[PDB]
Design a protein around this motif. Structure first.
Motif, PDB file in Angstrom:
ATOM      1  N   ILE A  92       1.013  -1.100  -0.027  1.00  0.00           N
ATOM      2  CA  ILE A  92      -0.012   0.350  -0.368  1.00  0.00           C
ATOM      3  C   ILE A  92       1.435   1.145  -0.133  1.00  0.00           C
ATOM      4  O   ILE A  92       0.360   2.193  -0.522  1.00  0.00           O
ATOM      5  N   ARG A  93       1.351   1.291   0.443  1.00  0.00           N
ATOM      6  CA  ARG A  93       3.228   2.774   1.145  1.00  0.00           C
ATOM      7  C   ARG A  93       3.338   2.820  -0.436  1.00  0.00           C
ATOM      8  O   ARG A  93       3.822   4.091  -0.313  1.00  0.00           O
ATOM      9  N   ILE A  94       4.327   1.359  -0.836  1.00  0.00           N
ATOM     10  CA  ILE A  94       4.759   1.978  -2.092  1.00  0.00           C
ATOM     11  C   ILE A  94       3.793   1.782  -3.262  1.00  0.00           C
ATOM     12  O   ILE A  94       4.344   2.838  -4.104  1.00  0.00           O
ATOM     13  N   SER A  95       3.506   1.853  -3.398  1.00  0.00           N
ATOM     14  CA  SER A  95       2.243   2.201  -4.569  1.00  0.00           C
ATOM     15  C   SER A  95       1.602   3.966  -4.371  1.00  0.00           C
ATOM     16  O   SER A  95       1.258   3.876  -5.492  1.00  0.00           O
ATOM     17  N   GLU A  96       1.322   4.074  -2.941  1.00  0.00           N
ATOM     18  CA  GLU A  96       1.820   5.350  -2.855  1.00  0.00           C
ATOM     19  C   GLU A  96       2.074   6.419  -3.173  1.00  0.00           C
ATOM     20  O   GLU A  96       2.530   6.624  -4.153  1.00  0.00           O
ATOM     21  N   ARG A  97       3.243   5.578  -3.036  1.00  0.00           N
ATOM     22  CA  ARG A  97       4.453   6.840  -3.688  1.00  0.00           C
ATOM     23  C   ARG A  97       4.195   6.768  -4.783  1.00  0.00           C
ATOM     24  O   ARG A  97       4.898   8.106  -5.486  1.00  0.00           O
ATOM     25  N   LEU A  98       4.629   5.624  -5.195  1.00  0.00           N
ATOM     26  CA  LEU A  98       5.003   5.798  -7.129  1.00  0.00           C
ATOM     27  C   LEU A  98       4.143   6.705  -7.749  1.00  0.00           C
ATOM     28  O   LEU A  98       4.131   6.724  -8.420  1.00  0.00           O
ATOM     29  N   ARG A  99       3.298   7.449  -7.120  1.00  0.00           N
ATOM     30  CA  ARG A  99       2.404   8.144  -7.207  1.00  0.00           C
ATOM     31  C   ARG A  99       2.102   9.884  -7.751  1.00  0.00           C
ATOM     32  O   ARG A  99       2.143  10.509  -7.867  1.00  0.00           O
ATOM     33  N   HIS A 100       2.474   9.959  -5.864  1.00  0.00           N
ATOM     34  CA  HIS A 100       2.464  11.131  -5.498  1.00  0.00           C
ATOM     35  C   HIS A 100       3.937  12.000  -4.826  1.00  0.00           C
ATOM     36  O   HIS A 100       3.836  13.073  -5.005  1.00  0.00           O
ATOM     37  N   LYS A 101       5.316  10.669  -5.404  1.00  0.00           N
ATOM     38  CA  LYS A 101       6.674  10.936  -5.566  1.00  0.00           C
ATOM     39  C   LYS A 101       7.225  11.907  -4.248  1.00  0.00           C
ATOM     40  O   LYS A 101       8.458  12.237  -4.694  1.00  0.00           O
ATOM     41  N   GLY A 102       6.081  12.237  -3.417  1.00  0.00           N
ATOM     42  CA  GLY A 102       6.724  12.471  -1.939  1.00  0.00           C
ATOM     43  C   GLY A 102       6.561  14.127  -1.607  1.00  0.00           C
ATOM     44  O   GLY A 102       7.290  14.234  -0.608  1.00  0.00           O
ATOM     45  N   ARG A 103       5.895  14.334  -2.499  1.00  0.00           N
ATOM     46  CA  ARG A 103       5.832  16.038  -2.676  1.00  0.00           C
ATOM     47  C   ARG A 103       4.034  16.163  -3.243  1.00  0.00           C
ATOM     48  O   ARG A 103       3.394  15.270  -3.104  1.00  0.00           O
ATOM     49  N   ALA A 104       4.008  16.982  -2.317  1.00  0.00           N
ATOM     50  CA  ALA A 104       2.300  16.973  -2.108  1.00  0.00           C
ATOM     51  C   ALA A 104       1.855  18.602  -2.680  1.00  0.00           C
ATOM     52  O   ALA A 104       1.853  19.625  -2.733  1.00  0.00           O
ATOM     53  N   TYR A 124      -1.272  15.456  -0.366  1.00  0.00           N
ATOM     54  CA  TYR A 124      -2.322  16.053   1.208  1.00  0.00           C
ATOM     55  C   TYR A 124      -2.948  14.658   1.547  1.00  0.00           C
ATOM     56  O   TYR A 124      -2.309  14.949   2.867  1.00  0.00           O
ATOM     57  N   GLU A 125      -3.707  14.373   1.160  1.00  0.00           N
ATOM     58  CA  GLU A 125      -4.315  13.112   2.450  1.00  0.00           C
ATOM     59  C   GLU A 125      -3.799  11.997   2.820  1.00  0.00           C
ATOM     60  O   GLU A 125      -3.634  11.652   3.492  1.00  0.00           O
ATOM     61  N   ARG A 126      -3.158  11.613   1.115  1.00  0.00           N
ATOM     62  CA  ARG A 126      -1.964  10.321   1.803  1.00  0.00           C
ATOM     63  C   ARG A 126      -1.705  10.249   2.385  1.00  0.00           C
ATOM     64  O   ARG A 126       0.080   9.124   3.379  1.00  0.00           O
ATOM     65  N   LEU A 127      -0.286  11.215   2.422  1.00  0.00           N
ATOM     66  CA  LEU A 127       1.324  11.850   3.293  1.00  0.00           C
ATOM     67  C   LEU A 127       0.496  11.447   4.470  1.00  0.00           C
ATOM     68  O   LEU A 127       1.676  11.448   5.657  1.00  0.00           O
ATOM     69  N   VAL A 128      -0.339  12.138   5.035  1.00  0.00           N
ATOM     70  CA  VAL A 128      -0.658  12.224   6.637  1.00  0.00           C
ATOM     71  C   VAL A 128      -1.680  11.330   6.972  1.00  0.00           C
ATOM     72  O   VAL A 128      -0.539  10.537   7.782  1.00  0.00           O
ATOM     73  N   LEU A 129      -1.665  10.250   6.406  1.00  0.00           N
ATOM     74  CA  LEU A 129      -2.159   8.720   6.446  1.00  0.00           C
ATOM     75  C   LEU A 129      -1.036   8.268   7.257  1.00  0.00           C
ATOM     76  O   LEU A 129      -1.521   6.897   7.595  1.00  0.00           O
ATOM     77  N   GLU A 130      -0.339   8.147   6.347  1.00  0.00           N
ATOM     78  CA  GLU A 130       0.994   7.441   6.173  1.00  0.00           C
ATOM     79  C   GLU A 130       1.735   7.466   7.712  1.00  0.00           C
ATOM     80  O   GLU A 130       2.384   7.182   8.168  1.00  0.00           O
TER      81      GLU A 130
END
Lengths: 99, 99, 99, 297, 141, 100, 100, 100
Positions: free
Chosen positions: A1-13, A19-25
């Motif tokens: 879950i974590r890595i599939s989300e990072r491959l989309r937002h690249k760690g930037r908001a 904004y939503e996924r960087l907080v929940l993680e």
């Protein structure tokens, strides 16, 4: 879950999804969060302005599934945690965004 | 790496000085530039200095080239001692007459 | 979404969906990487009829199903002025048998 | 997307040594709001008004290296126009939505002159000691960043997600998009900023670290621009000019040397030559795919 | 650009989020212009779904203006818009523009005039009934 | 016309104060490409006025049209009928005599 | 000759402290119509020196007289015997050949 | 190109503070002998680049060589093969026709 989300937002908001996924993680003690676009909050009046280009606002709910508090139907988040989340998000976003 | 960062212009200036006095050692510069992968173009004639100017100008130019050459020389000499033991412990196929 | 009555066989719809998915999967990394990037106004050779556009356009047009992302003319209607008012005819005035 | 992500891209352009961003807070021409006529205008309607500064603009501050290449007729000169053109072409290709760049500014430099009275140990030589002082102070004032290979950063324990966080892609297929010198450590990038106030104790504690130095009897600093003294100096702190980077003014400093109430001579010109000779070298070159990406096994 | 303020605003703070949005039309504002006549764009329920998608994708701190225009205004915009882009590029690409300010001023007069197109109202009783919030009024004569 | 580089360099020293006569002498003594009608090398994107002189390939050209023009990319001195030159008229005439 | 417009514009800023040097580079890098001998378009009321170059109608002219002269209203390059030009000598010679 | 002497003289007055726009307008409005390629009269000891234009005796010359060169005391436009001019080619051609 974590890595599939990072491959989309690249760690930037830059967008509602980021904004939503960087907080929940990073903060597991949150249950739900919502990102408000172009909105500002006035602390002195407790009023939210629905049109204010250049600002972002978030509203959060605590978990409460394993602990008891004094009001379980309208819970609150501690003031020190609200500030800890603003600092993290200011470091991974544009300099011209107010959060 | 060091040579690719530092030693192009000293070479060009030395070659111009040599052409001024009427004889060039093309083989040396060709060998050096071919070994290290540099680019030293055809030079101009510096018959202007330092045998045609104030003895101070004649001093400054020579010191200016020497300082860069000696900086790079010293950097290599100083860093060498830190690799001797690894050059030994990293293989099991040394020549027997040496081991 | 199918706005109008679709006469395509279910096999054709499934084939089109597979085709679109494969293309989206091949394109994704560059759609995601530049999602916040703006168009370049320094490029004096790529002003019109070009793909020198923002990543926002590319993502949104892909999500809606439009397959041409360029700065092109979108207005093809014009109004002219016609001064030609002379007109020839031949007639036998009996019951206006006319050409 | 953020400030450091842009600093790391600017530092990777040949000729740029460092870089900083700053927000524009005062916009020229000035714009005033006329409430009576409900319109914007250049003139102050009341002579007591505010300027309605628009937001979203940056100011780029550059630090350039000085090449001093030899000309065709035999002289030495410096030319930076091509670096400015390349910086502009790079920046205008990477701006985000609703942001622009107001201007590009080249920073200058100040020289810090140091006056001091030092007590030496009996087994000491003033010449080498002064060389070490100049070297250590110059290293203190103007640090430089190191470029790494991917493998030597992985050997420090950093996950690739923290290394590639803000970089733009270097290759597309087999086509190189831009040339790259390696990776910069974020932790070291965040530690290099422009200071505004210098404090003498930061020099006191480093002069006290040289072998042979016994005690510091006197120490003060002064500001030089264009070779001319700008002020009288101060024993404890000095304020810097907005547009200039501090460096060591070797030609304008003076350090006296005393051994047990007796003065000792020092050949200052030989000290200056030795100082120039002992400067450390650095590596800044172009690297290929093997040192930049990670292929599939 | 226009600012839409009134004299009574002189007694409030310039940092008010509502006032600041009106006097500062240059910060984090974006305009999108779309033609209305294509047959998928004449359907109001479809028209509103497209607007929602654009707002989800845009960055969080940016506001959008969306207009659905006819044939007369689409051409008036495209001609002025094209000429300004070409002049802007020339100043950046070696200071070679002519009449940059005049081309700009002819564009700032068209933006305030863009309006959405809706069909005309006809009362329904017991062939195109008027629906509230999506119909326009006619004229006396 | 009045002063040389070594005379102008004498007014701008390290401890002096500025004055308007120094700038008057600076402006009068250098070449004002608008008022003396000389613009150097042709560039597209400029605006020219009647009487301007411009160097294009191996020739100097004077503009004939009396109203201002914008130097267009694909209009170049020799192609258009704004500019003029004698080194081309005489060139062609001598070429004709050579051929005859 | 040493610097371009984009290099000179880099020394003059509001937050920059100026000096004698900047002006040295400014004076050396522009065209000094006295020291490089080029005055643009002829004007009456000036004074010229031996070697000056001036553009009058469709020709460049160099002054021959060794002493300074005052540019008189009714003495114009072509009428007087101070100035000289080759585009007129060659013009007349080729005209002669054409007529012959 | 933008302003005249009487407009530039208007920014330097008895009581006028300095600013960077004044110098921008000053630099843009005068002739930059490096960027517009025109150096006036040929001089020994100067370095030139491809495209430079120089006046030597009764002719204007453009440099052909693509690399920088140095004005040699002996190498003068007409002797060397760096420079070029049309007023000399045409001169010799018309001389030939005249002789024939």
């Amino acid at each position: 879950i974590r890595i599939s989300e990072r491959l989309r937002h690249k760690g930037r908001a830059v967008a509602i999804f980021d904004y939503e996924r960087l907080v929940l993680e990073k903060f597991p003690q949150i249950y739900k969060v919502r990102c408000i676009n172009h909105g500002q909050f006035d602390d002195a009046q407790e009023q939210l302005y629905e049109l204010a280009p250049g600002s972002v606002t978030l509203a959060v709910i605590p978990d409460l599934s394993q602990r008891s508090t004094t009001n379980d139907l309208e819970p609150k988040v501690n003031i020190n945690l609200l500030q800890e989340i603003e600092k993290y998000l200011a470091s991974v976003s544009s300099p011209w965004a107010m959060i | 790496g060091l040579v690719k960062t530092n030693l192009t212009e000293p070479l060009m200036r030395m070659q111009s000085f040599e052409l001024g006095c009427g004889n060039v050692d093309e083989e040396f510069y060709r060998g050096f530039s071919g070994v290290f992968g540099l680019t030293i173009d055809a030079p101009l004639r510096s018959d202007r200095t330092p045998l045609m100017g104030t003895v101070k100008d004649a001093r400054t130019e020579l010191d200016t080239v020497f300082q860069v050459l000696l900086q790079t020389y010293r950097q290599i000499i100083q860093q060498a001692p830190n690799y001797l033991k690894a050059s030994l412990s990293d293989r099991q196929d040394h020549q027997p007459f040496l081991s | 979404y199918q706005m109008f009555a679709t006469r395509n066989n279910k096999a054709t719809q499934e084939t089109e969906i597979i085709h679109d998915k494969a293309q989206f999967l091949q394109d994704y990394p560059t759609l995601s990487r530049d999602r916040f990037r703006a168009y370049n106004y320094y490029d004096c050779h790529a002003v019109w009829d070009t793909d020198n556009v923002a990543g926002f356009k590319k993502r949104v047009l892909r999500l809606l199903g439009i397959d041409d992302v360029r700065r092109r003319h979108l207005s093809h209607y014009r109004v002219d002025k016609d001064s030609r008012n002379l007109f020839l005819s031949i007639d036998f005035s009996s019951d206006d048998l006319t050409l | 997307v953020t400030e450091l992500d842009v600093r790391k891209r600017l530092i990777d352009i040949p000729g740029v040594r460092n870089a900083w961003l700053q927000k524009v807070t005062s916009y020229e021409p000035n714009i005033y709001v006329n409430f009576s006529d409900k319109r914007l205008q250049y003139n102050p309607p009341t002579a007591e008004s505010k300027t309605l500064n628009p937001r979203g603009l940056y100011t780029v501050r550059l630090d350039l290296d000085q090449d001093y290449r030899k000309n065709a007729c035999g002289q030495i000169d410096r030319s930076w126009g091509d670096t400015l053109d390349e910086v502009k072409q790079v920046l205008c290709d990477s701006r985000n939505l609703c942001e622009d760049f107001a201007d590009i500014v080249i920073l200058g430099e100040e020289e810090i002159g140091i006056c001091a009275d030092i007590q030496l140990e009996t087994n000491a030589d003033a010449e080498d000691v002064l060389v070490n002082i100049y070297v250590r102070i110059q290293q203190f004032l103007s640090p430089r960043l190191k470029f790494y290979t991917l493998q030597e950063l992985l050997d420090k324990g950093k996950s690739p997600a923290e290394i590639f966080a803000g970089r733009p892609s270097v290759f597309d297929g087999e086509n190189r998009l831009y040339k790259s010198h390696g990776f910069i450590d974020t932790d070291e990038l965040e530690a290099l900023t422009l200071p505004t106030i210098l404090h003498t104790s930061d020099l006191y504690q480093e002069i006290l670290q040289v072998p042979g130095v016994s005690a510091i009897k006197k120490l003060s600093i002064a500001n030089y621009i264009n070779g001319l003294r700008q002020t009288q100096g101060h024993p404890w702190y000095l304020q810097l000019t907005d547009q200039y980077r501090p460096v060591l003014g070797v030609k304008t400093s003076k350090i006296n040397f005393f051994k047990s109430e007796l003065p000792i001579g020092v050949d200052e010109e030989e000290v200056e030559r030795r100082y120039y000779e002992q400067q450390a070298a650095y590596i800044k070159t172009i690297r290929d795919r093997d040192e930049l990406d990670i292929p599939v096994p | 650009l226009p600012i839409l303020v009134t004299p009574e605003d002189v007694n409030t703070e310039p940092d008010d989020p509502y006032l600041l949005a009106r006097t500062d039309p240059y910060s984090f504002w974006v305009t999108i212009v779309l033609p209305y006549w294509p047959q998928r764009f004449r359907d109001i329920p479809f028209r509103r779904f497209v607007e929602r998608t654009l707002r989800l994708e845009a960055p969080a701190h940016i506001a959008l203006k969306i207009a659905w225009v006819n044939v007369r205004q689409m051409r008036d915009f495209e001609l002025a818009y094209r000429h300004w882009l070409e002049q802007l590029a020339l100043e950046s690409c070696e200071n070679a523009a002519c009449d940059l300010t005049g081309t700009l001023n002819r564009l700032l007069k068209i933006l305030p005039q863009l309006r959405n197109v809706y069909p005309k109202a006809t009362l329904h009783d017991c062939n195109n009934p008027a629906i509230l919030n999506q119909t326009a009024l006619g004229t006396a004569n | 016309n009045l002063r040389k580089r070594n005379e102008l360099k004498s007014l701008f020293k390290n401890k002096s104060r500025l004055s308007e006569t120094y700038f008057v002498e600076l402006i009068d003594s250098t070449l004002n490409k608008r008022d003396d009608r000389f613009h150097g090398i042709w560039k597209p994107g400029q605006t020219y006025q009647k009487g301007d002189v411009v160097y294009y390939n191996h020739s100097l050209w004077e503009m004939q049209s009396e109203n201002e023009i914008c130097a267009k990319e694909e209009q170049t001195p020799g192609i258009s009928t704004d500019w003029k030159s004698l080194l081309k008229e005489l060139e062609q005439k001598v070429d004709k005599l050579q051929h005859e």
